[PDB]
Amino acid sequence: SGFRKMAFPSGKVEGCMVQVTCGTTTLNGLWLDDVVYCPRHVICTSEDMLNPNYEDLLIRKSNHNFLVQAGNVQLRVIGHSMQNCVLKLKVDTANPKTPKYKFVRIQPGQTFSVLACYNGSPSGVYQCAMRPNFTIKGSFLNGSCGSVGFNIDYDCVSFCYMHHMELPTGVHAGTDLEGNFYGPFVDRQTAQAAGTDTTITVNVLAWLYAAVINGDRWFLNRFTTTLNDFNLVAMKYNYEPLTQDHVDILGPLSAQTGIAVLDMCASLKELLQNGMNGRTILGSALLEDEFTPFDVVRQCSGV
Amino acid sequence: SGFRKMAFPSGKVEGCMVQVTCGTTTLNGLWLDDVVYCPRHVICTSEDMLNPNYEDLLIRKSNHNFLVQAGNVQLRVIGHSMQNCVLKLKVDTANPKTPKYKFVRIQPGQTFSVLACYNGSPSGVYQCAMRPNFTIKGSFLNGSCGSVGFNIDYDCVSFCYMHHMELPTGVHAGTDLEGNFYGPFVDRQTAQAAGTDTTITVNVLAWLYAAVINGDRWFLNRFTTTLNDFNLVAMKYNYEPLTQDHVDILGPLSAQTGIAVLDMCASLKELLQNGMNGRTILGSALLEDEFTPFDVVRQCSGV
Ligand SMILES: *C(=O)[C@H](C[C@@H]1CCNC1=O)NC(=O)[C@H](CC(C)C)NC(=O)/C=C/c1ccccc1
Ligand SMILES: *C(=O)[C@H](C[C@@H]1CCNC1=O)NC(=O)[C@H](CC(C)C)NC(=O)/C=C/c1ccccc1
């Protein structure tokens, strides 16, 4: 029993983190086979940050302008190329610690683990969700760019995020490992706003099922609701519409607890309309939306 | 910027996790040099759980009653002994992945990372605090015993917790790595209650400083308070007394934000007396007490 924001074990990714320096700029890179992946803004200087032309900065660079260090072993760069907003630095050594891996792009509402790193050295690990507005609410300081986000299935690491920047609101923005940004952000020093965010409804429901599985039942009721009448309430509270596919995805959790999905919807509607009146759910006074149904099943399987 | 419940990178501990089976009971062990550490209740049977006499079960055991597996490599047990509530299984192979390590016992109010494991295989990592009543609010299922809690400084893993049991309230109890329980718990299948818990005051203050460092300032005021008048309020809300040593420990955070400790105490007093009135601090509608001052400095250093 218990329910915690749980990250994947980070060892397999720790073995892939290197330090990449260009000029006076040092950040993190991801070393897989004989390629090191890092944010392309490592080649930028303070004088070309409003609108850097990246193919230009890059054409003016050599292999010997890139210093790659794995621990305290220097890697020789033998090739460089740009892939959207990431640099691919070919090195003369394949990483002997390369795990089986995939480059996957995730969907808003999905979760992943972030291994925060500085100077190629892992600092901490925590769980993030991709917000509906394609930002993440992370914990990143200067020097953290190139830190990655990932999921693990079996023994295969699915990389899904590389960190590039922080917005004025304090949330974070980055790319998939093909260098394509999540959301309408660009790797340049503005002054960029995220679109309006919303609450991930299917996740809130998943977390209520986690609560029931852990013995928190006070929010349940006899009411049921139609999917239509629920989504009418959801839209008023800035919650994403709940689809039949979300209902199907919640199937196993519904079956394990004997609470129909539309019944839990009726509990959610009351919570949205009345609040909690000073009670908590799984230790929170807020409705939590950064646990997926999979996260709940993975952590609560067999009570 | 940002503030997340952050665990230490788990790689160094992942390399130490093994599977230990005795009879039909399988749980996790910690393999350091040529010793495997695990909960002694691995030698118990269903018929001897109310009051197992452990020296008895142990005298009746041989080395060949213990099957130790590291991944899919079997380790030969060449010696066994009991140290309080842990078993020490001497094996014929020193773990080549042994990190530099220490066995440290922590204090209530201190935090650590837990690597949850099943069948010797790491499942997830998350951050825990030792509660004032010597329980932890973790996430543990059947098969998780022998999972460990730890901190890292530099490259040295300080192990502080091994998991043994869950209480009826859903909180968790275990030992240090010398096998000595945290709190008044025993490794037998009762029905055991924790003493009354309290809120870790110095940590709540640390987290308010984190909030200010991250731009959440709405709870600040011009009031200051005496340490005496604050502790009068704290005792009424089940908060631990704040000592001068706690005030000194908060020194660096006070200096970084320019908010005197006793000034933040005055903010805390108002929050305890009025609540938040629907506002949040660092994304929480509750006052968070599982971040130490060190946790805050480590994550917020340089804004
Ligand atoms: C990379 O390490 C760094 C990570 C930042 C630093 C602070 N928190 C983070 O996540 N990325 C950058 O510094 C990035 C560089 C660009 C050339 C892409 N710029 C930003 O993150 C912020 C730009 C900004 C923010 C707010 C107002 C105006 C500009
Ligand atoms: C070890 O893997 C296991 C972990 C439990 C299982 C469920 N959540 C956990 O943390 N430890 C035990 O099962 C332990 C065995 C004893 C012989 C020490 N017993 C318990 O955790 C619970 C005992 C209990 C709880 C509630 C009411 C009555 C008894």
Side-chain angles (χ1 to χ4, degrees), chain B residues 108-140:
Chain B
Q110 286 313 113
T111 53
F112 56 99
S113 304
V114 168
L115 179 70
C117 307
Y118 301 88
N119 296 107
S121 289
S123 170
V125 62
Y126 56 88
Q127 196 72 350
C128 279
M130 183 60 64
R131 302 309 308 175
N133 68 4
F134 292 104
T135 63
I136 71 172
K137 303 171 177 172
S139 177
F140 290 114

Side-chain angles (χ1 to χ4, degrees), chain A residues 26-28 39 41 44 48-49 52 54 118 139-146 163-169 171-173 181 186-192, chain B residues 1:
Chain A
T26 283
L27 44 65
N28 305 280
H41 68 75
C44 291
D48 54 37
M49 299 193 296
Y54 277 103
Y118 301 88
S139 177
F140 290 114
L141 301 176
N142 272 57
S144 65
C145 290
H163 183 52
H164 292 246
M165 54 198 300
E166 178 170 303
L167 304 187
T169 52
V171 304
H172 300 103
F181 257 93
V186 288
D187 46 348
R188 61 177 85 149
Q189 198 100 351
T190 37
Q192 280 173 77
Chain B
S1 148

Side-chain angles (χ1 to χ4, degrees), chain B:
Chain B
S1 148
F3 202 71
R4 283 278 196 166
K5 213 148 249 174
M6 192 169 309
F8 285 105
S10 64
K12 286 184 174 60
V13 178
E14 294 169 54
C16 298
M17 301 309 302
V18 301
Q19 188 189 245
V20 179
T21 297
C22 191
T24 54
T25 299
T26 283
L27 44 65
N28 305 280
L30 185 69
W31 181 22
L32 298 167
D33 298 316
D34 69 333
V35 180
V36 170
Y37 305 81
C38 72
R40 69 180 179 171
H41 68 75
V42 69
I43 68 181
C44 291
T45 69
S46 154
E47 311 89 39
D48 54 37
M49 299 193 296
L50 282 182
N51 227 351
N53 192 291
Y54 277 103
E55 297 281 7
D56 265 19
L57 308 169
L58 191 53
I59 196 68
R60 293 157 190 167
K61 296 286 174 198
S62 286
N63 285 344
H64 76 84
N65 300 132
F66 299 100
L67 174 71
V68 178
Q69 312 182 55
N72 184 37
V73 163
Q74 188 209 340
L75 301 181
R76 179 174 163 250
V77 169
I78 67 175
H80 61 281
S81 70
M82 202 171 41
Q83 171 144 50
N84 305 305
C85 299
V86 294
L87 283 194
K88 301 171 65 178
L89 302 180
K90 196 184 197 186
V91 295
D92 66 352
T93 322
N95 183 356
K97 297 176 193 175
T98 302
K100 310 330 194 263
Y101 69 94
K102 301 200 284 208
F103 287 173
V104 179
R105 186 176 176 97
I106 60 162
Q107 286 291 317
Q110 286 313 113
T111 53
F112 56 99
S113 304
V114 168
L115 179 70
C117 307
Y118 301 88
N119 296 107
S121 289
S123 170
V125 62
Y126 56 88
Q127 196 72 350
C128 279
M130 183 60 64
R131 302 309 308 175
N133 68 4
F134 292 104
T135 63
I136 71 172
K137 303 171 177 172
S139 177
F140 290 114
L141 301 176
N142 272 57
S144 65
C145 290
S147 300
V148 298
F150 62 95
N151 285 280
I152 308 186
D153 49 57
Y154 274 46
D155 284 307
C156 172
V157 183
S158 293
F159 296 100
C160 58
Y161 179 83
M162 184 168 272
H163 183 52
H164 292 246
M165 54 198 300
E166 178 170 303
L167 304 187
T169 52
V171 304
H172 300 103
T175 64
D176 63 28
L177 266 293
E178 323 284 0
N180 305 113
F181 257 93
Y182 289 105
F185 309 108
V186 288
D187 46 348
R188 61 177 85 149
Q189 198 100 351
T190 37
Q192 280 173 77
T196 296
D197 209 18
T198 48
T199 297
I200 305 154
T201 307
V202 63
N203 288 6
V204 175
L205 293 169
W207 169 82
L208 288 177
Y209 278 113
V212 171
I213 291 170
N214 278 271
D216 264 332
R217 306 183 55 94
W218 62 264
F219 49 87
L220 299 176
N221 56 49
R222 287 305 338 146
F223 308 140
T224 190
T225 186
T226 69
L227 192 49
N228 288 351
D229 296 340
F230 171 81
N231 278 319
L232 269 295
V233 179
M235 221 206 318
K236 215 169 201 213
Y237 286 84
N238 210 20
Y239 271 55
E240 299 192 297
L242 192 74
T243 75
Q244 188 54 39
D245 185 54
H246 295 143
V247 175
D248 296 333
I249 279 154
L250 289 166
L253 287 175
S254 186
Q256 176 181 2
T257 62
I259 302 173
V261 172
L262 284 176
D263 280 28
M264 192 70 87
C265 283
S267 293
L268 185 44
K269 174 186 316 187
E270 301 298 304
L271 292 169
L272 289 171
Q273 293 173 345
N274 314 315
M276 312 201 190
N277 197 42
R279 282 163 298 188
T280 60
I281 301 179
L282 283 178
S284 176
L286 293 191
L287 301 173
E288 299 287 335
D289 80 336
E290 299 211 346
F291 297 95
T292 69
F294 174 98
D295 294 343
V296 171
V297 170
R298 158 193 180 222
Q299 211 179 139
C300 301
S301 267
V303 187

Side-chain angles (χ1 to χ4, degrees), chain A residues 30 37 83 86 103 148-149 159-162 175-179:
Chain A
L30 185 69
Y37 305 81
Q83 171 144 50
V86 294
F103 287 173
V148 298
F159 296 100
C160 58
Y161 179 83
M162 184 168 272
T175 64
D176 63 28
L177 266 293
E178 323 284 0

Side-chain angles (χ1 to χ4, degrees), chain A residues 10 114-118 121-126 147, chain B residues 6-10 298:
Chain A
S10 64
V114 168
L115 179 70
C117 307
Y118 301 88
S121 289
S123 170
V125 62
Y126 56 88
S147 300
Chain B
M6 192 169 309
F8 285 105
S10 64
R298 158 193 180 222

